[PDB]
């Protein structure tokens, strides 16, 4: 439409692309997971696959506008390729992550960007104990590939992994599923480091 | 082709890209399937693979023209990447969907776009009972990835999955194949949500 087509144009084709966070201007990023299923286990290789949705939230001053100057538009969706996006990455993966959906975000007049692609991840996990009462735990830290806590502030809004889409006929049952954020201070180093630790305790149904 | 090239030149190359639908300017997208075969059933992982043609239809003012100004040309074929196409996707895929054909659309002088590519889709399904005489039911729902019922109005013309092309020597027998639209009203949320639920009930032939 008229104004949206104008809005997007002013936000994207006018200014240079956000160059990323810095210690003088730390960016807060909120992360959460919606676990759909544990689609694979492999005891011959100690590999585990998940299928879940991954949301990430951040706010950028450069993506701000006056709605009144743009036909009262409060927000819009756009290709995630049109914006800057974080490097929140799994740290102990065994394969290249697969995207199971489009990558489209939502920018809000105040600057909020939200983004939730579907993913399949293969990570390191010895699953011996899966076929049993007590089950087995699998942990996989998530954090930024290259920013310390001084530049990107990784936060979760709840320590609890969303299991409301966890498959009814999945071969496994979630004994527990947490997304706890830890902030590490290393005696070696002045800057802090943040990871969000995905811990999933589960067994064969 | 001088007439045709000039037309395409005027539509695509001269007017900003359709920025997608809004609450202010909604869009009806019609979706339907043609199931060819159920190609993989995996009891150990719980995934099913289907090959089918996926049909998508919508109309845009941005894409209408007067045949008289373009030598009576009423409709043309151009590749889907030349146009805006919706984000209708399977909310439960376990692998990136695989395109099995060229993606080319037919644009009409009235703004009607149609697009029917073939696809291999792996999704979540517990197939216990496929050997049985009663079969097994697998379900996957399709919907916009980023749009609500207020921006994308998703429908079907028939609740029947078209089985006129089903592979005659399939290892499987289709007991029923439906593509039913569902409108969701959540207690939490003002805006409605629409999925087109693809349900196939089948057994070994």
């Amino acid at each position: 439409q008229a104004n949206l087509m104008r809005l997007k144009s002013d936000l994207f084709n006018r200014s240079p692309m956000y160059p990323g966070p810095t210690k003088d201007d730390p960016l807060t990023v909120t992360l959460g997971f919606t676990l759909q299923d544990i689609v694979k286990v492999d005891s011959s290789t100690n590999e585990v696959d998940l299928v879940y949705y991954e949301q990430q939230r951040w706010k950028l001053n450069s993506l701000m506008w006056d709605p009144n100057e743009y036909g009262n538009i409060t927000d819009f969706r756009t290709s995630a390729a049109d914006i800057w996006t974080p490097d929140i990455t799994a740290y102990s993966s065994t394969r290249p992550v697969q995207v199971l959906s489009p990558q489209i975000a939502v920018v809000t007049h105040d600057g909020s960007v939200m983004f939730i692609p579907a993913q399949r991840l293969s990570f390191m996990c010895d699953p011996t104990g899966v076929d049993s009462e007590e089950g087995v735990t699998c942990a996989v830290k998530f954090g930024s590939w290259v920013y310390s806590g001084f530049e990107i502030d990784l936060k979760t809004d709840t320590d609890q992994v969303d299991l409301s889409s966890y498959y009814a006929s999945s071969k496994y049952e979630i004994l527990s599923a947490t997304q706890t954020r830890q902030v590490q201070h290393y005696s070696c180093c002045p800057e802090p480091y943040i990871d969000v630790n995905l811990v999933v305790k589960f067994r064969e149904r | 082709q001088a007439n045709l090239m000039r037309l395409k030149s005027d539509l695509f190359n001269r007017s900003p890209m359709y920025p997608g639908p809004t609450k202010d300017d909604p869009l009806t997208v019609t979706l339907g399937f043609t199931l060819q075969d159920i190609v993989k059933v995996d009891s150990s992982t719980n995934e099913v693979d289907l090959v089918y043609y996926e049909q998508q239809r919508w109309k845009l003012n941005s894409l209408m023209w007067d045949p008289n100004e373009y030598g009576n040309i009423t409709d043309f074929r151009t590749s889907a990447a030349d146009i805006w196409t919706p984000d209708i996707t399977a909310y439960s895929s376990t692998r990136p969907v695989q395109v099995l054909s060229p993606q080319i659309a037919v644009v009409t002088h009235d703004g009607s776009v149609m697009f029917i590519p073939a696809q291999r889709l792996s999704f979540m399904c517990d197939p216990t009972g496929v050997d049985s005489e009663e079969g097994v039911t697998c379900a996957v729902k399709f919907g916009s990835w980023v749009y609500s019922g207020f921006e994308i109005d998703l429908k079907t013309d028939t609740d029947q999955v078209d089985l006129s092309s089903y592979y005659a020597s399939s290892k499987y027998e289709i007991l029923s194949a439906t593509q039913t639209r569902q409108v969701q009203h959540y207690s939490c949320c003002p805006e409605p949500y629409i999925d087109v639920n693809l349900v196939v009930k089948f057994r070994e032939r």
Binding site: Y53, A118, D162, S165 | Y91, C188
Partner: peptide
């Protein structure tokens, strides 16, 4: 549920 679908999660981040 709302939180079981992508477009609803985009519209209701905290509300999920």
């Amino acid at each position: 549920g709302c939180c079981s679908r992508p477009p609803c999660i985009l519209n209701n981040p905290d509300l999920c």
